[PDB]
């Protein structure tokens, strides 16, 4: 039993809810919240900008030190950093950004990072300002992640479309 509430069950291990991932993280304080990161961990907008703002920019300060030491992530890669006031840990995962021409096949590699964590609160990778089709992102998630994932979808219209079209 865990503390996640109000989710629709899609499969044995995937759950989905119309929610703001920031407010959901604040309320549950999950072990892991996933950030929709870019390779530079520049958390300017989208999910990343919202998560970072909620940490009062502490996520960005930590991230800048990480990049200065380690260099950029790979598209499809991830790193574990602090969850600050939102979670124990933040798993920063880089899905391909279609608006940069990145290969959508890398979306499966991105979701494979979730399998290193037993339970996660997450957005749909490569959705929103990353330009991919969220219906496709949900399909890759379900077909790749084997651990227990709780997906937060900000847009109510999109959430209803994702549920109604789910095979
Ligand atoms: C609609 C207003 C809004 C405020 N904050 C948001 N955060 C994320 C998304 C969003 C998501 C998500 O993860 O829910 C996905 C997937 N695509 N898009 C575009 C939308 C908003």
Swiss-Prot record:
Catalytically driven reaction(s): Thiol-dependent hydrolysis of ester, thioester, amide, peptide and isopeptide bonds formed by the C-terminal Gly of ubiquitin (a 76-residue protein attached to proteins as an intracellular targeting signal)
Activation/inhibition comment: Inhibited in vitro by GRL-0617.
Domain Macro, first and last residues per copy: 1-167
Outcome when changing residue 31 to A: In strain: Mu/B.1.621
Topology of this chain in the membrane: Multi-pass membrane protein
Coiled coil: none
Localization per record: Host endoplasmic reticulum membrane
Domain of life, per lineage: Viruses
Subunit structure comment from the entry: May form homohexamers. Interacts with N protein.
Function: Responsible for the cleavages located at the N-terminus of the replicase polyprotein. Participates together with nsp4 in the assembly of virally-induced cytoplasmic double-membrane vesicles necessary for viral replication. Antagonizes innate immune induction of type I interferon by blocking the phosphorylation, dimerization and subsequent nuclear translocation of host IRF3. Also prevents host NF-kappa-B signaling. In addition, PL-PRO possesses a deubiquitinating/deISGylating activity and processes both 'Lys-48'- and 'Lys-63'-linked polyubiquitin chains from cellular substrates.
Protein name as catalogued: Papain-like protease nsp3
Organism: Severe acute respiratory syndrome coronavirus 2
From-to range in the entire protein, with total length: 1025 to 1191 of 7096
